């Protein structure tokens, strides 16, 4: 899975609490950052419930408990093709001879 | 005098069909700036200009604000999609009913044929849902629609509820324009 080494999900109390954490983590990152280690960008500051920060080999997701209940990111990444959310949705096939009937 | 040239479209439709009569209750939707309300009040004598002729009633509901008129009351801002606004229409109309429905409402043209069509037709579907408690049996219904795919769909459900569905394209309306008016008289059910 050609994305990252380590995926991290953390929850928060309030919207402003999430900003606190994300902004501390990025701030501390820069302190301990290697010179050649590229700079990072926080994502979704405008967003209410979901914040994300990508590092080199770590990816972190800051959410409310509300968004955790609807995204189930842990389930997706632990078991890929076998999750419940993929099961409900079925691929649509065109009919043979390509004729629709009512 | 008329606040917009839209009033002339109603005049052409009226003369052919005699949709507006003295002492006949009228509901106008999307009334503002009030060209359709101004032309309606003259014919129904809601202003009470003619002593011998009976006096009607006109109400107009629109999102944008409207100046007051003689013999007409307005409720704005209001949206017909909102069911709350319907009860406010109910209370003001005398005799618990409105005899005439005029629907010249149209959501702002985005400039895409498909998107504009869908919103206006579905807006008329909401009107059709709210007809029973507003429209008196044997009452007349007039709605403004853009031409498209689901124009036929709107016709089919109109033929269920009304005796006759009359497709009108007025001369006052630009010939090159795609706007079409559906008239539906003799309400049953």
């Amino acid at each position: 899975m050609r994305y990252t080494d380590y995926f991290v999900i953390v929850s928060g109390t309030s919207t402003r609490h999430l900003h606190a954490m994300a902004f501390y983590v990025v701030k501390m990152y820069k302190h301990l950052k290697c010179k050649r280690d590229p700079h990072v960008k926080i994502e979704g500051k405008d967003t209410d419930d979901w914040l994300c920060v990508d590092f080199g080999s770590m990816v972190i997701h800051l959410m409310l408990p509300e968004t955790r209940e609807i995204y189930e990111l842990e389930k997706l990444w632990t078991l890929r093709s076998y999750d419940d959310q993929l099961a409900q949705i079925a691929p649509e096939t065109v009919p043979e001879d390509f004729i629709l009937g009512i | 005098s008329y606040r917009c040239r839209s009033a002339f479209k109603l005049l052409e439709v009226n003369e052919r069909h005699q949709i507006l009569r003295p002492g006949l209750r009228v509901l106008d939707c999307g009334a503002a700036p009030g060209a359709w309300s101004q032309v309606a009040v003259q014919k129904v004598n809601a202003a009470g200009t003619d002593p011998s002729s009976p006096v009607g009633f006109v109400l107009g509901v629109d999102l944008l604000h409207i100046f007051p008129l003689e013999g007409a009351t307005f409720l704005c801002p209001a949206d017909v999609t909102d069911p709350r606004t319907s009860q406010r229409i109910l209370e003001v109309l005398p005799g618990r009913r409105a005899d005439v429905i005029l629907s010249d409402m149209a959501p702002n043209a985005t400039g895409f044929r498909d998107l504009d069509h869908d919103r206006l037709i579905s807006l008329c579907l909401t009107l059709l849902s709210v007809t029973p408690d507003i429209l008196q049996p044997g009452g007349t219904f007039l709605c403004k629609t853009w031409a498209g795919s689901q124009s036929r769909r709107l016709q089919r459900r109109l033929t269920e509820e009304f005796q006759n569905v009359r497709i009108i394209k007025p001369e006052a309306s630009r010939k090159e324009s795609s706007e079409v008016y559906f008239l539906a008289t003799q309400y049953h059910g």
Binding site: T13, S14, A20 | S1, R5, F67
Partner: protein, 337 residues
């Protein structure tokens, strides 16, 4: 870039109350001309309509913090007049008036808007409808020049913009009870503090930080006096902020021989302003306890006011923590849901 040090009399800049006459954009319009062509010399009537007047809206801005920026009279932009060639006038652009967060709009005895939120708007005046042209009125019957009228000047509305400072808690006390001092102690805010009475004329908001990433705003108003209903002292004009404040801080100095009578005077004057203010929930706080005379009178305070009253010093910051506990507890009590 440095903030300029402020004079005590900063009430010169800060404005809480303003009478505004708002008028929308005028119709303008008016064309009564005639088209001519080489082959067709008469051509026909040729009058463009005019654009509609722009509306006036009191958009709320966070970064105004005063009603000083609003003017006595506002006039909306009028729409362009109709020209020849059946050219229409452009409608006027919308006029926006930026107004503080704690603003309230009153027209004719009753409130029309309470714009106490962020981004919320109220239409101050409707722009007037643009007049008709010569091309309008053309029919089979006419072929004639009437320019109508300019038509519908913008709507004239007189309203009172009134600022009520929005906070969770306010402070009430006699002059030189050390309200400003206490605010300076608990918050990072710097209100002007001095020994001479009737300081801090402008209301001062500081917030208090907590561990749960939540902030509680406390307001400091100028000193109040017994009476104040006859506009004695500074009056009770500044009391407008406290309406929005969820609870009150009764700051009482122990320097005075009978501090127990202080709260009695305070509750009486609040009643004089508004009935429910006296019945409104509160906390009583004593100040300047570093002085020995305060320590002497403490016993009789315990006798009259009781144990529930929290005793504090501002200068030395004595028992500040109990205040913070009480602030948080009152918030969690009746400031929720």
């Amino acid at each position: 870039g440095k903030k300029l040090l402020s004079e005590k009399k900063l009430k010169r800049y800060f404005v809480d109350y303003r009478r505004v006459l708002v008028c929308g954009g005028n119709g303008g319009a008016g064309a009564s001309c005639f088209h001519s062509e080489p082959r067709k010399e008469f051509g026909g009537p040729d009058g463009g309509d005019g654009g509609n007047g722009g509306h006036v809206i009191l958009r709320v801005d966070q970064q105004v913090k005063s009603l000083s920026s609003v003017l006595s009279r506002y006039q909306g932009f009028s729409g362009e007049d109709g020209g020849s060639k059946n050219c229409f006038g452009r409608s006027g652009a919308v006029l926006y008036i930026r107004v503080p967060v704690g603003t309230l709009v009153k027209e004719g005895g009753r409130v029309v808007a309470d714009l106490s939120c962020v981004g919320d708007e109220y239409i101050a005046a409707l722009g007037g409808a643009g007049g008709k042209g010569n091309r309008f009125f053309l029919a089979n019957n006419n072929r004639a020049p009437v320019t109508c009228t300019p038509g519908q000047p913008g709507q004239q509305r007189v309203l009172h913009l009134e600022l009520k400072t929005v906070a969770h808690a306010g402070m009430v006390g006699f002059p030189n009870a050390g309200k400003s001092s206490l605010l300076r102690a608990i918050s990072n805010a710097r209100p002007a503090v001095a020994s001479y009475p009737f300081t801090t004329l402008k209301p001062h908001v500081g917030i208090v930080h907590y561990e749960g990433h939540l902030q509680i705003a406390v307001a400091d108003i100028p000193g109040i006096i017994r009476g104040a209903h006859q506009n004695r002292g500074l009056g009770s004009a500044f009391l407008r902020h406290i309406e929005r404040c969820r609870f009150l801080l009764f700051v009482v100095d122990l320097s005075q021989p009978e501090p127990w009578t202080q709260v009695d005077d305070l509750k009486y004057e609040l009643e004089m302003y508004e009935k429910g203010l006296s019945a409104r929930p509160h906390a009583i706080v004593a100040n300047k306890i570093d002085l020995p005379e305060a320590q002497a009178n403490l016993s009789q305070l315990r006798d009259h006011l009781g144990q529930e009253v929290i005793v504090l010093s501002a200068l030395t910051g004595e028992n500040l923590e109990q205040l913070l506990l009480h602030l948080k507890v009152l918030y969690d009590a009746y400031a929720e849901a």
